[PDB]
Amino acid sequence: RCELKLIASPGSWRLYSARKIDERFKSYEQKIFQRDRYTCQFCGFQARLYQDIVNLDGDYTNNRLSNLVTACCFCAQCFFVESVGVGGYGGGTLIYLPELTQAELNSLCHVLFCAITNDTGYKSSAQNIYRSFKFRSQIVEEKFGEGTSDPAIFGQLMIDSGVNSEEIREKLFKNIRLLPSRAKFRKQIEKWAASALEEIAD
């Protein structure tokens, strides 16, 4: 149930996706979900569709049954900030907010998608909050320059500029949280919702 660290690692995606099409990262993929009840161990999400397993140790070769964990669709891309918003689905916008641990931002951003998609009355409020998460992004654009708000880019400027240390990486990602954007997670936040309201209301 570890915490999230926005690891801008250069060549983890190549391996991480590479496994995703094989069966060894799939035969396990069923074994690990059952043990973890499709629950997202980082942020608490619990749903059947679009959940994939991340490695804790920072390496994606050693897939034993203990290092692997299951994490939702917002945390998984949070582990590869060097490219997100380019690799098919997934999206985000770096923002500057220290008041919430990155987990308390993924989980709180689900509840703001299940009260904007399947409006139960709080849709007026949820957009008002969400208005004030995206808006913070203009500060992480003021310090680091224009056009490098989006994590797809701000990830690019790191390993292209050659930083690896657990220190100079940490002090640089301090007080930066990856806000998952609604408008690019639309093929999902409706697929989860509409699949939810069809099991219950038959």
Binding site: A47, N118, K187, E190, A194, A196, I200
Partner: protein, 283 residues
């Protein structure tokens, strides 16, 4: 162990919140899931509303994009094309479409207002149903006790309340209602508790479970309407997602063929952001 998706549990709980009936603490895992429930039926009218709550949202994204394509057009290059040119070559075929997008605007908008009445009209009743259940549950609560405190067989109070709730969650009496089905319930309330006989007491309770069964029934007949209105209000709504997808498609090629105007990839790539959903989400 048959859990519930956390997009569901947020929505399935929060609806019950509006009804102020949070009698279950942990049975919410097993109640609003079991098919022959009762909180499921109290739930199945506002849930489907929410399901039309997204389709009339997907369509009203095309409609929002459709007005933009024209608003760009109508602000810039409308009159600079003389009559009798290539300018009017398809422009008239556009000033048709403005008319079609201005009626689908004020007909679709009549759909939102019927929705907002349907939810209002529905919830306004189902709330009047649940609370009147709570009160009438309270009276049986005490009264069923006085019929059970008299028992030589010593049973508690909160034990029996947890006993009854499981009789509505292990069998249904909302739709398949009869005079024998109550006995399966009555023999299900007895068996959840340890033991009872009460042969006259099987009669002596039937008079008391009445106010539940009555107030239960006004869920079927008020589920008689609302489902009949909801399929309409969804069939109508699914349509409006199609015939906006046409007006938004016809325009993108009709306006494409002007000689001296175009839609730049700058505003389009940002207007076309909320148009990446799926269409086939209602049936």
């Amino acid at each position: 162990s048959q859990w519930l998706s956390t997009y569901g549990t947020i929505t399935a709980e929060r609806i019950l919140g509006r009804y102020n009936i949070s009698l279950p603490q942990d049975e919410i895992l097993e109640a609003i899931n079991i098919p022959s429930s009762f909180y499921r039926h109290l739930l199945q009218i506002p849930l489907k509303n929410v399901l039309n709550g997204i389709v009339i949202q997907q369509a009203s994204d095309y409609h929002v994009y459709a007005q933009k394509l024209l608003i760009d057009y109508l602000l810039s290059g409308e009159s600079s094309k003389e009559p009798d040119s290539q300018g009017a070559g398809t422009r008239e075929s556009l000033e048709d479409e403005r008319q079609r997008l201005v009626q689908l605007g004020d007909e679709f908008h009549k759909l939102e207002l019927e929705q907002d009445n349907l939810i209002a009209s529905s919830q306004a009743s189902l709330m009047k149903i649940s609370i009147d259940w709570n009160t009438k549950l309270e009276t049986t609560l005490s009264k069923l006790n006085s019929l059970y405190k008299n028992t030589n067989s010593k049973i508690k109070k909160n034990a029996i309340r947890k006993a009854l709730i499981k009789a509505f969650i292990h069998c249904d009496l909302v739709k398949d209602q009869s005079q024998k089905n109550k006995y399966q319930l009555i023999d299900k309330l007895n068996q959840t508790l340890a033991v009872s006989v009460g042969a006259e007491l099987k009669e002596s309770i039937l008079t008391n479970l009445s106010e539940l069964f009555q107030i239960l029934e006004a869920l079927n007949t008020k589920l008689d309407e609302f489902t009949d209105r909801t399929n309409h209000l969804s069939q109508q709504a699914k349509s409006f997602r199609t015939q906006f997808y046409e007006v938004i498609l016809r325009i993108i090629e009709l306006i494409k063929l002007l000689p001296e105007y175009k839609i730049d990839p700058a505003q389009d790539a940002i207007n076309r952001e909320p148009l990446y959903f799926d269409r086939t989400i209602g049936e």
